[PDB]
Swiss-Prot record:
This is Histone-lysine N-methyltransferase SMYD3. Belongs to the class V-like SAM-binding methyltransferase superfamily. Histone-lysine methyltransferase family. It comes from Homo sapiens (Human). A zinc finger (MYND-type) spans 47-85. It comes from the Eukaryota. The lineage of its organism: Eukaryota, Metazoa, Chordata, Craniata, Vertebrata.
Amino acid sequence: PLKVEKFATANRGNGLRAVTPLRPGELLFRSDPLAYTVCKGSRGVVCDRCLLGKEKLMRCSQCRVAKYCSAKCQKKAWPDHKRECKCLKSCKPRYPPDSVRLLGRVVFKLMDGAPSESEKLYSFYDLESNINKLTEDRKEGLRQLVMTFQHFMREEIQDASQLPPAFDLFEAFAKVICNSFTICNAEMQEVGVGLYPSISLLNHSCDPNCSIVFNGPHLLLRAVRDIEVGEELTICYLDMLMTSEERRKQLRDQYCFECDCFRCQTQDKDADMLTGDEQVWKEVQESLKKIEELKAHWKWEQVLAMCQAIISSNSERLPDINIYQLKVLDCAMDACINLGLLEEALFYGTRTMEPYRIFFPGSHPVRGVQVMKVGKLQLHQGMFPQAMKNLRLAFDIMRVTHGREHSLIEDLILLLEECDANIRA
Ligand SMILES: C[S@@+](CC[C@H](N)C(=O)[O-])C[C@H]1O[C@@H](n2cnc3c(N)ncnc32)[C@H](O)[C@@H]1O
Ligand SMILES: [Zn+2]
Ligand SMILES: [Zn+2]
Ligand SMILES: [Zn+2]
């Protein structure tokens, strides 16, 4: 019996609404992807199948592009990799855009696969394309994606007889632009991209009542507020560390809508997010383009060097509530964790705690994981009472955002039992 249902909204197309009263932490839906792939920067760093990092991955001998953590993952991936393998090989050393590899997997799944549980509420065929709102600039970009797909797939797809009935590649890429989910690993790093068509019913809010979290490619949808029967379910499509101007640009450019929510009407939190000298934070925002690019490619030493040049600048510094400063602190913390600089990681991580409390209100999985990382860093350095406080807070958040069905909650229940025994001792 589903707790959610598809409905026609007044002015935001189709949506999902509650069938039954929902409480914070309630599991509403869970889905494997219709199709997914690893992202450009994580290719050959994480397993193509399970999206877990491993120092040495095994490569597909045929294409040498797909890489796996294990014989189990390589073998289990083969049916969904078989047809793209011929195309990735044939187009060596060209690697396609992530959207093109993703749509390849969509087409092979729809042609060769049994009906997907991912499409239970809503199918790829049903997805919003926003074709009547696309700008001429966007349409030109979509025409290039169509020709890129035609080139990439030529070994496996020669004509429309090898696409689903009346499948339109332009319309398919338009659907991918506004229905793609970025898959994060347990540590909330972007590692993949997938389509989850049932989950695609959820409309956006800058202050949502639901949250999604990934456990490998598996998506969990949870309530993070009380929700009444018939109330629309919403998620935030966007990173929380964004001003209303930045959200406006992304919701226009990617999603073709104007956000009417209270936060956008009032520029909620924009002033605090932009505190400090504007010349300095403009420079840090500019530097973050490179820092985030390096992070996406797991280049931790280069990330840390660029972040230290800002955090410990000889020139003017920013407050930690400035969102560009905060993103630099978080990138520096993760670089330090990966480089085993755990003292320096904890310095940066603790500085993010109050800004995260402000910018991730209520129960947000990004805050839950940040607090768990700081708790773990404290536990490693023998700060047992402070570690226990942070691991308990992480559990309070993550019982709502992750739940018992997420493997990270099992790992946190272990850190809590350990920290508790130390305190008992
Ligand atoms: C992932 S789909 C959500 C489901 C979609 N409404 C449908 O009918 O399939 C994203 C699209 O939904 C619409 N949308 C989502 N949130 C919205 C909002 N808050 N206001 C208006 N339109 C919204 C836009 O067309 C956006 O590109
Ligand atoms: Zn694997
Ligand atoms: Zn292969
Ligand atoms: Zn808004």
